[PDB]
Amino acid sequence: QPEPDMITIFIGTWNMGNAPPPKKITSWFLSKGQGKTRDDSADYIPHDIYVIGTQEDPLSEKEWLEILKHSLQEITSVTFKTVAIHTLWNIRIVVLAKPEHENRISHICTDNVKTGIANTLGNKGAVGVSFMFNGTSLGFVNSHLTSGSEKKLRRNQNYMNILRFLALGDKKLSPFNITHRFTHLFWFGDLNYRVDLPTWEAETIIQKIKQQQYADLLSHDQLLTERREQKVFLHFEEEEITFAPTYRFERLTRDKYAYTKQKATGMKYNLPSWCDRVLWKSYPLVHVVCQSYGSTSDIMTSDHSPVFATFEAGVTSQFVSKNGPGTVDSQGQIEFLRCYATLKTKSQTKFYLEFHSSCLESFVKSQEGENEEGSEGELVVKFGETLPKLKPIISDPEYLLDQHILISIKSSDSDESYGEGCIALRLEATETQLPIYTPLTHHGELTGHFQGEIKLQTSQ
Numbered sequence: 319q320p321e322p323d324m325i326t327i328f329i330g331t332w333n334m335g336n337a338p339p340p341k342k343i344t345s346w347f348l349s350k351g352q353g354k355t356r357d358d359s360a361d362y363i364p365h366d367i368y369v370i371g372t373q374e375d376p377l378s379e380k381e382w383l384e385i386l387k388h389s390l391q392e393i394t395s396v397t398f399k400t401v402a403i404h405t406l407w408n409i410r411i412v413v414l415a416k417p418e419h420e421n422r423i424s425h426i427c428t429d430n431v432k433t434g435i436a437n438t439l440g441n442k443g444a445v446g447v448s449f450m451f452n453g454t455s456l457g458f459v460n461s462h463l464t465s466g467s468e469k470k471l472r473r474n475q476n477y478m479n480i481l482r483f484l485a486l487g488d489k490k491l492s493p494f495n496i497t498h499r500f501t502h503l504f505w506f507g508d509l510n511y512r513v514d515l516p517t518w519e520a521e522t523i524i525q526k527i528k529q530q531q532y533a534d535l536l537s538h539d540q541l542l543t544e545r546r547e548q549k550v551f552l553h554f555e556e557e558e559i560t561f562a563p564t565y566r567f568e569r570l571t572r573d574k575y576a577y578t579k580q581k582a583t584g585m586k587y588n589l590p591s592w593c594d595r596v597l598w599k600s601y602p603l604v605h606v607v608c609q610s611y612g613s614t615s616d617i618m619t620s621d622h623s624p625v626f627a628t629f630e631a632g633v634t635s636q637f638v639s640k641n642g643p644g645t646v647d648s649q650g651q652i653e654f655l656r657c658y659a660t661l662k663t664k665s666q667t668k669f670y671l672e673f674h675s676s677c678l679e680s681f682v683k684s685q686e687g688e689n690e691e692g693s694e695g696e697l698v699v700k701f702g703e704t705l706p707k708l709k710p711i712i713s714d715p716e717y718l719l720d721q722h723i724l725i726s727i728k729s730s731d732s733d734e735s736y737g738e739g740c741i742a743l744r745l746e747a748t749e750t751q752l753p754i755y756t757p758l759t760h761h762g763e764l765t766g767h768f769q770g771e772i773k774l775q776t777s778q
């Protein structure tokens with residue numbers, strides 16, 4: 319029975335509003351309702367992996383697992399295996415997988431981050447799960463960020479704390495945060511960004527929603543506008559939104575948005591907003607295609623509607639040759655020519671590189687580059703033709719062209735990373751000098767660039 323080249327992943331995010339769910343929630347897992355919905359002809363076809371993020375979840379892990387496994391069994395006639403479950407307060411992530419995948423999944427990790435200090439510490443944060451699926455690393459984050467239309471900067475701060483401190487994936491990747499540790503990273507939840515229009519426009523907003531005219535609302539969505547200004551979620555993707563705002567509904571119908579200020583809201587307005595979101599980030603030139611992104615119309619116990627997203631995601635096998643794992647394959651090599659890092663730092667220490675990859679026995683440290691000043695004031699770290707020749711464990715091009723090299727540029731003085739990025743080996747040619755490029759980030763913020771040329775030798 320062959321190993322897969324592609325799987326499908328369901329992502330769900332639902333703020334349950336501290337109320338039990340209704341008897342039937344199958345529409346969520348079927349990607350039915352509003353937006354980009356799944357074809358009816360696919361209803362019996364199980365996804366390979368289901369990742370379910372809840373916020374304001376009143377249920378025990380046991381009670382929710384029961385409901386989820388029953389719902390999928392009813393849809394698919396498959397009994398799904400629990401990969402992981404992790405709860406922080408009322409923020410929960412469940413990962414279920416087809417039973418045929420139980421021996422494909424390893425290195426399962428869970429973690430949580432609590433956001434804010436004292437007053438703002440005690441209900442907002444994130445939970446996460448990671449694991450390996452054969453040769454592919456998968457990460458999943460469910461975050462409940464700060465609420466309130468006036469708090470987009472706090473939401474962005476919450477994102478940066480979660481990014482920095484959530485401990486998932488391979489601990490040997492020490493310079494790298496969750497935004498570089500996974501082939502595919504999915505980040506979802508009640509991100510709590512709002513439609514930033516005047517509160518006196520509430521009824522106008524509601525009439526735009528009733529007409530399914532979202533353009534003038536999305537142009538004021540704080541997550542889209544903060545992403546456009548590179549304030550948050552740098553280098554993540556989101557599918558176009560074609561569903562109505564998922565918040566804030568009167569419970570037990572979807573006919574009414576409840577937006578007016580009340581004692582229960584802290585005398586805040588809740589203009590209709592896309593609070594509930596799914597974003598992703600995959601390594602360069604890995605297949606990932608959003609197949610659905612929408613909200614359910616028939617699950618009405620919460621003041622939020624559930625959001626679904628589905629993906630086709632490229633995966634790779636657990637490659638074994640006669641040589642690696644356990645030794646190098648003399649036929650393989652990775653060379654770097656005419657490379658330099660451009661950094662935004664005002665500091666003047668020496669820098670070196672670290673190359674990290676699953677295709678290497680362990681990470682490689684370069685010698686120091688040569689600092690020059692750039693035209694427009696910046697630091698240019700020149701590596702020229704000085705970078706090491708990397709020795710992959712396997713030389714087979716069917717393995718090696720599917721790999722990636724993570725790069726960290728580190729201060730010689732402090733050994734701290736000033737920038738992280740990733741280079742795909744999915745090249746147009748082997749034995750040929752080709753341009754390479756990655757942006758460099760630190761704490762998820764742009765710090766510079768790395769560019770130069772690569773030359774890849776495979777056994778072909």
Ligand SMILES: *C(=N)c1nnc(-c2ccccc2)o1
Pocket residue numbers: 425426427428450485486487488489
């Ligand atoms: C999760 N807690 C965890 N720790 N280490 C790893 C891991 C090791 C090797 C490859 C992938 C992940 O995951």
